[PDB]
Curated annotation (Swiss-Prot):
PANTHER family: RIBONUCLEASE P PROTEIN COMPONENT. InterPro entries: Ribosomal_Su5_D2-typ_SF, Ribsml_uS5_D2-typ_fold_subgr, RNase_P, RNase_P_CS. This is Ribonuclease P protein component. Consists of a catalytic RNA component (M1 or rnpB) and a protein subunit. Pfam families: Ribonuclease_P (PF00825). Keywords: Endonuclease, Hydrolase, Nuclease, RNA-binding, tRNA processing. Its EC number is 3.1.26.5. HAMAP family: RNase_P. GO terms for biological process: tRNA 3'-end processing; tRNA 5'-leader removal.
């Protein structure tokens, strides 16, 4: 998952596909590899280091533990949505996991 966002975010956004739910947008494109790579784009307005780092930790953990079931061969960008910033402190880890995994497991084909 060393996805280098500064170069590849534009390309994924323009050429990839997207899925979303109330908490996340996930953008994805085929990478031509036998593994997927993750990047996380957290808007500055989501908060200071503690808050943004908490979200990024959760996201990294969910991807790492679930790599074996997430489809292979995609570059994936996870973007938290306004509603997740609104609600963060009231959403527990298992809900974040559920909501993220439902999009990740639908990346096709």
């Amino acid at each position: 998952e060393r996805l280098r966002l500064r170069r590849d975010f534009l390309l994924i956004f323009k050429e990839g596909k997207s899925l979303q739910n109330e908490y996340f947008v996930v953008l994805f494109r085929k990478n031509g590899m036998d593994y997927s790579r993750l990047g996380i784009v957290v808007k500055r307005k989501f908060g200071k280091a503690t808050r943004r780092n908490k979200l990024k930790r959760w996201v990294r953990e969910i991807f790492r533990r679930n790599k074996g079931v997430i489809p292979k061969g995609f570059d994936i960008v996870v973007i938290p949505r306004k509603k997740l910033s609104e609600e963060f402190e009231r959403v527990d880890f298992w809900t974040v996991r559920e909501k993220l995994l439902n999009l990740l497991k639908r990346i096709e084909g």
